């Protein structure tokens, strides 16, 4: 499935594989450029969908 990570530089939420999210804990610095998905891999790129749409996809 997908998980979502917040960029520590611009605070947009980025879709990442759920098989990797466990390695990103709250001490870790993660930014857009670290994203392997190059549709959404610098801080200028708009967020993929709204926060409420993300939470709906996650069922939270």
């Amino acid at each position: 499935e997908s998980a979502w990570v917040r960029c520590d530089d611009c605070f947009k939420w980025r879709r990442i594989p759920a098989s990797v999210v466990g390695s990103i804990d709250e001490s870790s610095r993660w930014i857009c450029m670290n994203n392997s998905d190059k549709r959404f891999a610098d801080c200028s790129k708009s967020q993929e969908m709204s926060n409420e749409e993300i939470n709906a996809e996650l069922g939270i």
């Binding site: 998980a3 979502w4 939270i60």
Partner: peptide
Amino acid sequence: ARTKQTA
């Protein structure tokens, strides 16, 4: 970093 995932 903050993350969100399915519960």
